[PDB]
């Protein structure tokens with residue numbers, strides 16, 4: 001569980017992410033795709049993209065970035081009480097998209113990398129630690145739903 005002071009560090013940087021949801025969303029997905037090419041293969045709608053320049057140019061990819069970050073933001077603002085928000089997400093990612101838990105660890109790394117690039121002053125070590133904990137909490141709860149359904153993995 002995160003303390004109230006750790007949640008404050010998380011939401012303070014998130015308010016910054018919200019000033020440019022689309023730019024952040026795009027940097028995160030591109031970092032994920034370049035760092036872990038096997039993840040791009042799960043998206044039939046983005047599979048045709050080969051270069052970083054093509055990725056940057058895709059308006060649809062940018063629109064999906066907003067989708068992801070808006071859902072994540074709704075979760076973070078619940079400060080751990082995210083049952084109603086996390087459940088639909090785990091069911092679709094487990095049974096429809098077939099996303100292994102390890103891929104959620106990859107996107108978490110991408111999120112941390114991008115927040116660091118874009119917000120050094122509001123993203124020092126302490127904030128980085130709180131963010132990691134929040135993303136771990138997210139993964140832990142998702143993993144529990146996956147197991148129940150028979151997808152732990």
Ligand code: COH
Pocket residue numbers: 039040042043044045067068069071072088089092093097099103104107
């Ligand atoms: C590596 C693949 C991968 C990862 C790590 C991932 C991680 C995350 C993530 C973690 C921070 C968040 C908050 C979301 C949030 C979403 N994802 Co994904 N998703 C993934 C693959 C997908 C795919 C595939 C779809 C469907 C895309 C499409 O065709 O529209 C998707 C759809 C969604 C949607 C649309 C509704 C739905 O289908 O549930 C939301 C919201 N998500 N996803």
